[PDB]
Amino acid sequence: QVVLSLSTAVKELVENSLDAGATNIDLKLKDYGVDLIEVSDNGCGVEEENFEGLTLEFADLTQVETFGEALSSLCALSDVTISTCHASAKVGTRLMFDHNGKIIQKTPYPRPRGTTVSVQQLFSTLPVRHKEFQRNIKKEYAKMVQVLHAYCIISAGIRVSCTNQLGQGKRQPVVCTGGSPSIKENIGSVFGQKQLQSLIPFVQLPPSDSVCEEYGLSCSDALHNLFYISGFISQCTHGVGRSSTDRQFFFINRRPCDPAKVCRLVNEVYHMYNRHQYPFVVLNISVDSECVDISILLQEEKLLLAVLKTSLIGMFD
Amino acid sequence: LSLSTAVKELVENSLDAGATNIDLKLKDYGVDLIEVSDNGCGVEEENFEGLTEALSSLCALSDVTISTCHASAKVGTRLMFDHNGKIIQKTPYPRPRGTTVSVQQLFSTLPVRHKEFQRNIKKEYAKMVQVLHAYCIISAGIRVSCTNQLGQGKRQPVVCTGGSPSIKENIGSVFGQKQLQSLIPFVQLPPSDSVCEEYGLSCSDALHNLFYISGFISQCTHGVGRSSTDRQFFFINRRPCDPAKVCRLVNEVYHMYNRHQYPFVVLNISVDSECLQEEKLLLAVLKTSLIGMFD
Ligand SMILES: Nc1ncnc2c1ncn2[C@@H]1O[C@H](COP(=O)(O)OP(=O)(O)OP(=O)(O)O)[C@@H](O)[C@H]1O
Ligand SMILES: Nc1ncnc2c1ncn2[C@@H]1O[C@H](COP(=O)(O)OP(=O)(O)OP(=O)(O)O)[C@@H](O)[C@H]1O
Ligand SMILES: [Mg+2]
Ligand SMILES: [Mg+2]
């Protein structure tokens, strides 16, 4: 599904940095992104033979919503500058592109290995969408921080930072991870040590007979269990939970997504022990890529739901 | 000795290792953790014992953990050191090439110095930011970043450069594009006859001029300057320092046109290593160029 939003725009630039094998990703914003969206990484960079080509199998979960290929769509909607340097390249380069993806000017640019993609005046070519962007900047910015917090939690060993600047004012911190190898440590960088106190780690269990009978699972149905689930969830004790689903993140094969059925189940089991609060949820479902399809479709999903409810109940008891 | 002198040596080690990415991690402004991560050359295993000079002083004053990976090494290594510099434990550690030096509980071995650190954490952190902003501005083509986390709060970005090859962009990354508006680039001129006579310099004295000066300074127009010397950085061969005579002179010329404000100063002095020799020639060149710029 094609989408043109602030959340889908930053997501593609981050995906490009992750695919490049980057360990440092810096996101710079101005006017919540209305004026500038800049993503800098120390990844592989782009070779000179692929400079013109910048703008011209198992299911990918991130491709549920594309933007506008992203880089060609971005040039048609704003002004894009790209400075990059490949390891095989002696000197880096700085590129300016027009609205059709043509390289306006290319100059040698001495810079460390990696790529920096700058997106200035997003949606400037569409005055109707640009005004709707400015008017609903609070909602577009809220959706972007949620996707940004999701990549920070799951990207262990990668330093992800973000700042925002309004007018001539000072840069404002948004989110920052320390390059920690564990997901638990990343949660402490995004939300603080206070958030980690009311959390318990997910402990997977085989589906119980009571839960298996609720979903209609035979002993044969559950024998080929290939779901490996891990993460953290809020304690079921009254008071330690949250008031909404504002901090609930889900991942399939380390890709942020939203399985509506899984989400309704995890919240329902929490309501069985804390009807007045919502849990903090960070949960990754590890499964073979072939068993995942996009219409989110998961083979033996009834077996996955039985494991989650059984494990959540055993933890909350 | 101090928090400012501790980060300075760790940055020098990363710079000397040929690093292009330098990350500084702090906790409680550095009272709890001082961590510097780079993508430099790393250390080979045969030189692990020789690591412990700044690094020897750091182990004697805190607990130091070092994770590194050499280009010739398949997998990195993680080292824990005691207060004598001895490797407590050495374990293989999968990490990208480079080095990460962690300094935890600085001055813990000296209860007197540790307490003075916490009591004066506001002043010591300001001195470290002055040393940190200097390396961000001068390290062209090097990504220098810093983060800090206080207590149970979240980690927050402090400063970050983009690896730009120019000093002007590094100034814009540290202080913002607004700072770049009231600045003019230094334009070097030969020392004036009037300025040469003030210092007692013959015409022969100025023929062997080896001073190459560059950088940026605030405009002398009233109002665009700053209220203090908070943003004045000086460099000799791209090394941050404070030449008192040079610093006093630059502020004196600025006051000649703006008596009520102090300039923003970023100045690098390039000179032959043996030479400060012939400082009267350097001051004559410095005073002459600033006047020609401010006229
Ligand atoms: N930060 C980056 N670092 C290195 N290469 C990049 C970077 N960003 C883009 N590229 C290169 O530009 C090309 C086009 O990127 P684009 O996002 O438009 O499509 P794609 O990444 O190839 O596929 P898709 O976005 O649909 O998953 C990429 O193939 C990549 O080689
Ligand atoms: N980030 C680093 N990356 C690679 N090698 C390092 C790093 N830090 C230290 N080393 C190596 O360990 C040795 C000890 O460092 P130390 O700072 O104590 O002394 P030095 O760097 O040789 O000179 P000085 O202490 O006078 O500045 C260094 O010589 C260097 O070879
Ligand atoms: Mg892409
Ligand atoms: Mg040294």
XYZ file of C-alpha atoms and ligand atoms in Angstrom:
676
model
C 0.000 0.000 0.000
C 1.443 3.327 -1.145
C 1.654 5.943 1.633
C 2.995 9.516 1.775
C 3.422 10.362 5.455
C 6.149 11.530 7.803
C 6.349 8.096 9.447
C 6.828 6.248 6.154
C 9.426 8.783 4.970
C 11.903 8.458 7.849
C 11.332 4.687 7.938
C 12.725 4.178 4.427
C 15.840 6.277 5.088
C 16.517 4.268 8.248
C 16.010 1.006 6.343
C 18.597 2.152 3.800
C 21.124 2.794 6.574
C 20.423 -0.571 8.225
C 20.774 -2.412 4.909
C 24.126 -0.676 4.364
C 25.479 -2.340 7.509
C 25.738 0.893 9.490
C 26.504 0.972 13.214
C 25.863 4.714 13.738
C 22.658 6.375 12.518
C 21.965 10.046 13.258
C 18.607 11.662 12.466
C 18.451 15.470 12.356
C 15.120 17.310 12.191
C 13.952 20.915 11.895
C 10.353 22.058 12.510
C 9.410 18.444 13.356
C 10.608 17.510 9.851
C 8.677 20.090 7.815
C 11.930 21.937 7.035
C 14.613 19.221 7.081
C 14.878 15.442 7.425
C 18.515 14.325 7.421
C 19.716 10.762 8.027
C 23.461 10.204 8.423
C 25.094 6.788 8.728
C 28.548 5.205 8.577
C 27.438 2.305 6.374
C 28.964 0.962 3.185
C 28.195 4.050 1.108
C 27.532 4.086 -2.621
C 30.079 3.481 -5.361
C 30.433 6.048 -8.130
C 29.078 3.690 -10.807
C 25.795 3.560 -8.851
C 25.404 7.334 -8.423
C 23.068 7.654 -11.405
C 21.280 4.430 -10.384
C 20.290 5.826 -6.973
C 16.960 7.004 -8.421
C 16.471 4.581 -11.348
C 11.825 -14.155 -2.463
C 10.570 -14.176 1.143
C 8.012 -11.554 2.149
C 9.416 -8.287 3.524
C 7.422 -7.075 6.517
C 8.601 -3.471 6.200
C 7.118 -3.274 2.678
C 3.521 -3.342 4.029
C 3.508 0.431 3.433
C 5.896 1.957 0.915
C 6.500 5.667 0.381
C 5.529 7.661 -2.697
C 11.506 3.003 -4.771
C 11.695 5.512 -1.935
C 14.600 7.633 -3.193
C 12.913 8.251 -6.553
C 9.671 9.123 -4.751
C 11.462 11.534 -2.401
C 13.046 13.586 -5.189
C 9.641 14.035 -6.814
C 8.371 15.485 -3.515
C 11.258 17.570 -2.124
C 14.918 18.530 -2.564
C 17.337 15.686 -1.773
C 21.073 16.054 -1.173
C 23.218 12.940 -0.741
C 26.859 12.880 0.365
C 28.442 9.440 0.433
C 31.766 7.624 0.390
C 32.414 3.955 -0.373
C 35.244 1.973 1.206
C 36.641 1.225 -2.263
C 36.454 4.958 -3.070
C 39.397 7.263 -2.443
C 37.220 10.367 -1.933
C 33.538 10.812 -1.177
C 31.016 12.728 -3.244
C 28.174 15.198 -2.703
C 25.137 14.931 -4.989
C 22.214 17.269 -5.649
C 19.076 15.922 -7.340
C 16.113 17.571 -9.067
C 12.466 16.475 -8.918
C 12.874 13.826 -11.645
C 15.880 12.165 -10.004
C 18.520 13.757 -12.240
C 21.903 14.580 -10.709
C 22.054 18.385 -10.771
C 25.683 18.606 -9.650
C 28.255 16.150 -8.318
C 31.338 17.354 -6.456
C 34.034 15.443 -4.556
C 33.261 15.545 -0.840
C 35.869 14.339 1.677
C 33.893 12.435 4.300
C 34.099 9.194 6.289
C 32.635 6.041 4.811
C 28.849 6.044 4.785
C 25.988 8.072 3.379
C 24.044 11.169 4.436
C 20.619 11.710 2.839
C 19.036 15.128 3.419
C 15.343 15.780 2.733
C 14.449 19.488 2.849
C 10.959 20.977 2.424
C 9.066 17.694 2.401
C 5.921 17.715 0.240
C 6.874 21.192 -1.022
C 5.854 20.236 -4.569
C 2.289 19.418 -3.375
C 0.780 22.519 -1.697
C -2.333 20.609 -0.560
C -0.388 17.779 1.089
C 2.215 20.248 2.395
C -0.457 22.266 4.212
C -2.064 19.110 5.607
C 1.454 18.156 6.743
C 1.884 21.440 8.633
C -1.632 21.471 10.094
C -1.373 17.876 11.382
C 2.317 18.081 12.284
C 1.555 16.971 15.843
C -0.009 13.704 14.637
C 2.562 13.047 11.899
C 5.356 13.639 14.413
C 3.720 11.299 16.939
C 3.560 8.452 14.414
C 7.229 8.970 13.505
C 8.491 8.841 17.100
C 6.615 5.563 17.610
C 8.340 3.960 14.616
C 11.633 5.533 15.694
C 11.304 4.121 19.216
C 10.584 0.709 17.668
C 13.813 0.572 15.652
C 15.809 1.802 18.661
C 14.625 -1.086 20.840
C 15.241 -3.915 18.369
C 18.522 -2.687 16.808
C 20.964 -4.013 19.387
C 24.572 -2.907 18.977
C 23.653 0.151 16.868
C 23.844 3.743 18.140
C 20.656 5.530 17.043
C 20.147 9.163 18.034
C 17.656 11.852 17.064
C 17.365 15.606 17.622
C 14.783 18.238 16.741
C 15.091 21.997 16.269
C 12.307 24.595 16.127
C 13.216 27.869 14.436
C 16.401 29.560 15.647
C 16.171 27.681 18.948
C 18.402 24.973 20.344
C 18.460 21.312 19.348
C 16.058 19.209 21.373
C 16.760 15.587 22.364
C 14.272 13.036 21.063
C 15.711 9.541 21.515
C 19.167 8.033 21.898
C 20.585 4.534 22.352
C 24.081 3.668 23.543
C 24.925 0.814 21.174
C 24.058 -1.869 23.730
C 24.012 -5.544 22.671
C 20.766 -6.344 24.542
C 17.176 -5.281 23.914
C 16.658 -4.686 27.645
C 19.451 -2.102 27.680
C 17.938 -0.362 24.636
C 14.644 0.007 26.525
C 16.539 1.817 29.287
C 17.968 4.283 26.763
C 14.616 5.048 25.106
C 12.371 5.214 28.182
C 14.759 5.193 31.153
C 15.592 2.881 34.040
C 12.218 3.669 35.624
C 10.449 1.861 32.776
C 12.607 -1.262 33.273
C 11.501 -1.665 36.899
C 7.885 -2.676 36.201
C 8.845 -5.156 33.456
C 9.219 -8.929 33.481
C 10.940 -10.956 30.741
C 8.889 -13.166 28.481
C 9.172 -16.849 29.422
C 7.913 -19.113 26.645
C 5.924 -22.237 27.524
C 4.335 -24.996 25.435
C 0.613 -24.436 24.841
C -1.499 -25.790 27.679
C -4.324 -28.252 27.133
C -6.778 -25.658 28.451
C -5.538 -23.064 25.957
C -5.229 -25.657 23.176
C -8.871 -26.638 23.633
C -9.919 -22.976 23.475
C -8.331 -22.596 20.026
C -9.190 -26.100 18.826
C -5.657 -27.507 18.703
C -4.937 -31.230 18.670
C -1.747 -32.765 20.027
C -0.649 -33.159 16.398
C -1.250 -29.444 15.758
C 1.196 -28.319 18.467
C 3.987 -30.856 17.885
C 5.646 -28.830 15.107
C 5.999 -25.649 17.132
C 8.473 -23.286 15.447
C 7.601 -20.045 17.283
C 10.392 -18.558 19.417
C 9.095 -15.594 21.422
C 11.083 -13.243 23.643
C 10.833 -9.755 25.060
C 9.389 -7.880 28.003
C 5.925 -7.034 29.282
C 4.575 -5.028 32.192
C 3.813 -6.666 35.497
C 0.154 -7.499 35.987
C 0.065 -5.872 39.440
C -2.372 -2.975 39.713
C -0.668 0.397 39.319
C 2.510 -0.662 37.504
C 0.848 -0.755 34.085
C 0.188 2.053 31.644
C -3.001 3.880 30.688
C -2.933 3.089 26.949
C -1.101 1.133 24.245
C 1.330 4.015 23.710
C 4.362 1.810 24.494
C 3.596 -1.504 22.778
C 6.028 -2.669 20.089
C 5.858 -5.889 18.070
C 8.449 -7.491 15.796
C 8.466 -10.483 13.434
C 11.995 -11.613 12.551
C 13.272 -8.340 14.056
C 11.030 -6.232 11.780
C 8.606 -3.767 13.441
C 4.979 -4.503 12.575
C 1.432 -4.649 13.967
C -0.336 -8.029 14.084
C -3.848 -6.993 15.093
C -4.825 -10.459 16.327
C -1.656 -10.872 18.415
C -2.101 -7.368 19.839
C -5.698 -8.008 20.916
C -4.611 -11.233 22.637
C -1.695 -9.802 24.620
C -3.891 -6.968 25.884
C -6.713 -9.391 26.703
C -4.476 -11.579 28.882
C -3.224 -8.484 30.721
C -6.835 -7.417 31.335
C -7.394 -10.833 32.933
C -5.067 -9.671 35.730
C -5.169 -5.844 35.402
C -8.453 -4.736 33.825
C -7.760 -1.021 34.405
C -4.266 -0.759 32.894
C -2.437 -1.438 29.639
C 0.935 -3.218 29.489
C 4.217 -2.009 28.150
C 4.916 -4.502 25.390
C 8.159 -5.304 23.587
C 7.760 -8.683 21.892
C 9.670 -10.323 19.029
C 8.302 -13.403 17.249
C 11.018 -15.463 15.569
C 9.725 -17.740 12.807
C 10.866 -19.076 9.450
C 10.568 -16.504 6.674
C 8.612 -18.845 4.378
C 5.753 -19.111 6.926
C 5.143 -15.288 6.703
C 2.996 -13.677 4.004
C 1.562 -10.225 3.303
C -2.037 -9.813 2.145
C 0.124 -10.025 8.047
C -0.362 -13.767 7.498
C 1.375 -16.380 9.669
C 1.212 -20.145 9.205
C -0.118 -21.976 12.279
C -1.181 -18.668 13.829
C -3.561 -20.486 16.183
C -0.519 -22.281 17.585
C 1.255 -18.938 18.046
C -1.717 -17.464 19.920
C -1.897 -20.519 22.195
C 1.776 -20.152 23.174
C 1.456 -16.428 23.931
C -1.619 -16.761 26.150
C -0.138 -19.771 27.954
C 3.183 -18.039 28.594
C 1.563 -14.761 29.644
C -0.750 -16.562 32.068
C 2.111 -18.525 33.615
C 4.060 -15.302 34.119
C 1.099 -13.360 35.552
C 0.106 -16.158 37.963
C 43.659 14.789 36.750
C 40.238 16.142 35.760
C 37.249 15.170 33.644
C 38.444 17.513 30.886
C 41.950 16.020 30.854
C 40.552 12.467 30.901
C 38.449 12.740 27.742
C 41.242 14.666 25.994
C 43.661 11.726 26.186
C 41.001 9.198 25.153
C 40.147 11.317 22.109
C 43.832 11.647 21.229
C 44.171 7.858 21.372
C 41.194 7.468 19.033
C 42.521 10.181 16.722
C 45.982 8.592 16.740
C 44.385 5.237 15.892
C 43.097 6.770 12.654
C 39.432 6.720 13.654
C 36.715 8.383 11.576
C 33.896 7.787 14.081
C 34.301 8.806 17.733
C 31.462 8.363 20.246
C 31.572 9.673 23.830
C 29.136 8.160 26.342
C 28.554 9.703 29.772
C 26.528 8.854 32.867
C 25.793 11.417 35.592
C 27.848 13.898 33.537
C 30.680 11.352 33.779
C 30.597 10.667 37.524
C 29.284 7.158 36.815
C 30.662 6.339 33.346
C 33.065 7.784 30.775
C 33.059 5.689 27.591
C 34.813 6.488 24.298
C 34.146 4.272 21.267
C 35.956 4.551 17.933
C 36.354 2.708 14.631
C 40.143 3.032 14.583
C 42.841 0.451 13.969
C 42.290 -1.420 17.237
C 44.939 -3.290 19.202
C 46.556 -6.600 18.310
C 46.507 -9.357 20.909
C 50.282 -9.299 21.425
C 49.958 -5.654 22.539
C 47.112 -6.248 25.005
C 49.435 -6.415 28.027
C 51.369 -3.336 26.892
C 48.271 -1.129 27.143
C 49.101 -0.288 30.779
C 50.762 7.378 30.320
C 47.044 8.105 30.486
C 45.753 4.523 30.406
C 47.961 3.476 33.329
C 46.729 6.457 35.359
C 43.091 5.615 34.573
C 43.257 2.047 35.903
C 44.896 3.300 39.114
C 41.929 5.659 39.620
C 38.893 3.642 38.449
C 37.739 0.382 36.854
C 38.623 0.168 33.152
C 37.047 -2.209 30.631
C 38.391 -2.310 27.067
C 36.789 -4.040 24.079
C 38.765 -3.963 20.837
C 39.116 -5.686 17.474
C 42.060 -5.499 15.089
C 41.750 -5.644 11.309
C 44.055 -8.671 11.232
C 41.954 -10.238 14.011
C 38.945 -12.390 13.185
C 37.087 -11.596 16.422
C 37.482 -8.830 18.966
C 38.373 -9.138 22.630
C 37.097 -7.791 25.954
C 39.528 -6.947 28.759
C 38.962 -6.147 32.428
C 41.727 -4.431 34.398
C 42.466 -4.025 38.085
C 43.948 -0.939 39.747
C 47.518 -1.961 38.848
C 46.762 -2.309 35.126
C 46.684 -6.115 35.204
C 44.206 -7.951 32.985
C 41.641 -9.443 35.362
C 39.923 -11.416 32.605
C 40.234 -11.575 28.826
C 37.358 -12.922 26.746
C 36.627 -13.000 23.005
C 34.172 -10.231 22.203
C 32.337 -9.936 18.867
C 32.427 -6.274 17.849
C 33.283 -4.211 14.766
C 36.858 -3.111 14.262
C 37.878 -0.316 16.598
C 38.142 0.177 20.339
C 35.777 1.019 23.209
C 37.363 2.241 26.465
C 35.084 2.407 29.514
C 36.019 4.370 32.646
C 33.606 3.642 35.495
C 33.437 5.478 38.834
C 36.193 7.986 38.146
C 38.387 8.860 41.153
C 36.723 6.122 43.229
C 40.118 5.064 44.607
C 40.648 8.593 46.011
C 37.661 9.425 48.251
C 38.832 13.041 48.564
C 39.180 13.611 44.817
C 35.975 11.658 44.120
C 33.931 13.938 46.383
C 35.383 17.116 44.855
C 34.383 15.706 41.464
C 30.713 15.366 42.427
C 30.606 18.684 44.310
C 32.061 20.607 41.341
C 30.391 18.530 38.617
C 28.795 21.635 37.097
C 32.143 23.390 36.621
C 34.051 20.283 35.537
C 31.371 19.457 32.948
C 31.675 22.963 31.487
C 35.442 22.587 31.077
C 34.919 19.238 29.341
C 32.365 20.720 26.932
C 34.946 23.371 25.999
C 37.474 20.641 25.206
C 34.786 18.591 23.440
C 33.546 21.458 21.255
C 37.142 22.171 20.224
C 37.751 18.672 18.848
C 34.377 18.659 17.060
C 35.234 21.874 15.221
C 38.800 20.940 14.267
C 38.330 17.244 13.367
C 37.248 17.667 9.768
C 36.134 14.436 8.157
C 35.648 12.880 11.606
C 32.248 12.220 13.167
C 32.507 13.271 16.822
C 29.428 12.722 18.988
C 28.532 12.784 22.679
C 25.604 11.526 24.741
C 24.696 11.818 28.409
C 22.203 9.995 30.631
C 21.297 11.155 34.147
C 19.955 8.731 36.730
C 16.919 6.701 35.730
C 16.214 9.051 32.822
C 16.652 8.367 29.128
C 19.856 8.786 27.160
C 19.885 12.204 25.496
C 22.043 13.479 22.616
C 24.458 16.283 23.444
C 26.471 17.034 20.293
C 27.086 15.389 16.924
C 29.054 16.270 13.796
C 28.444 14.801 10.358
C 32.025 14.125 9.294
C 32.202 17.257 7.160
C 35.550 18.210 5.566
C 35.154 21.907 6.440
C 35.504 23.712 9.754
C 32.537 25.956 8.930
C 30.092 23.030 8.837
C 31.521 21.650 12.083
C 30.773 25.021 13.690
C 27.247 24.812 12.279
C 26.820 21.309 13.699
C 27.957 22.289 17.192
C 26.183 25.645 17.559
C 23.632 25.796 14.728
C 23.168 27.762 11.523
C 22.245 30.873 13.523
C 25.826 31.098 14.797
C 27.117 31.050 11.212
C 25.271 34.281 10.367
C 27.340 36.712 12.469
C 30.707 35.195 11.469
C 33.328 36.252 8.925
C 36.260 34.122 7.701
C 39.761 35.112 8.701
C 41.624 36.855 5.867
C 45.372 36.856 6.429
C 47.399 39.904 5.381
C 51.088 40.797 5.665
C 51.930 42.828 8.777
C 51.342 46.548 8.305
C 54.147 49.092 8.580
C 52.248 50.737 11.436
C 51.764 47.425 13.243
C 55.377 46.354 12.643
C 56.731 49.524 14.273
C 54.620 48.973 17.396
C 56.321 45.632 18.127
C 59.867 46.689 17.200
C 60.111 44.628 14.020
C 62.460 45.449 11.171
C 61.507 44.826 7.551
C 63.904 41.867 7.688
C 61.978 40.453 10.669
C 58.796 39.972 8.612
C 60.372 38.482 5.475
C 60.568 34.977 6.984
C 56.869 34.766 7.819
C 55.801 31.157 8.452
C 52.420 31.785 10.124
C 49.313 30.605 8.242
C 46.141 31.712 10.035
C 42.583 30.653 9.269
C 39.227 30.382 10.984
C 36.174 32.482 11.772
C 35.366 35.401 14.069
C 32.215 37.360 14.900
C 31.361 40.533 13.037
C 32.273 43.717 14.872
C 28.882 45.312 14.211
C 27.218 46.265 17.484
C 24.922 43.571 18.904
C 25.987 40.506 16.868
C 28.827 39.604 19.254
C 28.691 37.503 22.411
C 28.525 38.460 26.084
C 31.597 36.521 27.255
C 34.592 34.480 26.105
C 32.497 31.313 26.352
C 32.943 30.470 22.650
C 36.593 31.229 21.897
C 38.677 28.325 20.589
C 42.335 28.473 19.583
C 44.465 25.874 17.819
C 48.170 25.504 17.059
C 48.719 22.901 14.344
C 45.054 21.953 14.844
C 45.594 21.191 18.540
C 43.214 22.951 20.967
C 45.077 25.299 23.295
C 44.997 28.787 24.824
C 47.730 31.260 23.846
C 47.186 33.961 26.456
C 48.925 36.672 24.427
C 47.062 35.713 21.244
C 43.775 35.369 23.134
C 44.189 38.742 24.862
C 45.061 40.363 21.523
C 42.046 39.047 19.584
C 39.685 40.327 22.272
C 41.463 43.702 22.362
C 41.013 44.274 18.624
C 37.352 43.264 18.821
C 36.784 45.728 21.670
C 38.310 48.410 19.436
C 35.115 48.078 17.371
C 32.673 46.570 19.918
C 33.628 47.522 23.470
C 30.473 45.953 24.940
C 30.724 42.449 23.431
C 33.181 39.557 23.057
C 33.745 37.756 19.742
C 33.115 34.176 18.828
C 36.599 32.919 17.994
C 37.693 29.804 16.118
C 41.322 30.206 15.065
C 43.950 27.698 13.937
C 47.596 28.768 13.778
C 49.740 26.769 11.342
C 53.508 27.087 11.923
C 56.724 25.097 11.582
C 57.155 22.726 14.503
C 60.408 24.239 15.775
C 58.775 27.676 16.012
C 56.124 30.451 20.046
C 59.224 31.598 18.162
C 58.919 35.049 16.525
C 55.604 35.603 18.302
C 55.961 39.339 17.680
C 55.655 38.526 13.974
C 52.574 36.394 14.655
C 50.898 39.141 16.696
C 51.727 41.736 14.029
C 50.129 39.550 11.357
C 47.158 38.799 13.628
C 46.451 42.429 14.556
C 46.852 43.601 10.949
C 44.418 41.060 9.471
C 41.680 41.591 12.077
C 41.755 45.359 11.522
C 41.595 44.921 7.753
C 38.654 42.572 8.249
C 36.882 44.855 10.732
C 37.342 47.990 8.586
N 22.200 4.959 3.412
C 22.391 4.245 2.164
N 23.596 3.647 2.242
C 24.042 2.914 1.231
N 23.281 2.761 0.106
C 22.073 3.354 0.015
C 21.620 4.092 1.029
N 20.390 4.571 0.677
C 20.100 4.122 -0.540
N 21.138 3.367 -0.958
C 21.162 2.714 -2.267
O 20.030 3.397 -3.187
C 19.338 2.429 -3.753
C 17.852 2.829 -3.846
O 17.294 2.883 -2.560
P 15.595 2.747 -2.432
O 15.195 2.824 -1.034
O 14.888 3.899 -3.251
O 15.153 1.321 -3.036
P 15.730 -0.130 -2.392
O 16.383 0.146 -1.042
O 16.739 -0.717 -3.338
O 14.434 -1.190 -2.180
P 13.195 -0.918 -1.046
O 13.330 0.474 -0.487
O 11.831 -1.063 -1.721
O 13.310 -1.922 0.080
C 19.494 1.251 -2.833
O 19.516 0.112 -3.549
C 20.884 1.464 -2.153
O 21.894 0.665 -2.869
N 41.590 4.021 21.127
C 42.886 3.378 21.024
N 42.929 2.773 19.820
C 44.009 2.098 19.449
N 45.084 2.017 20.287
C 45.050 2.619 21.491
C 43.970 3.297 21.870
N 44.207 3.795 23.118
C 45.428 3.422 23.491
N 45.953 2.691 22.484
C 47.288 2.101 22.519
O 47.728 1.903 24.055
C 48.828 2.598 24.261
C 48.722 3.319 25.621
O 47.973 4.497 25.490
P 48.432 5.826 26.465
O 47.515 6.935 26.250
O 48.413 5.415 27.992
O 49.928 6.263 26.055
P 50.309 6.862 24.521
O 49.043 6.911 23.673
O 51.316 5.952 23.875
O 50.961 8.412 24.685
P 50.490 9.531 25.879
O 49.931 8.806 27.104
O 51.686 10.360 26.294
O 49.428 10.433 25.303
C 48.895 3.592 23.134
O 50.176 3.796 22.777
C 48.123 2.901 21.964
O 49.057 2.131 21.125
Mg 15.057 1.032 0.478
Mg 48.250 8.679 24.576
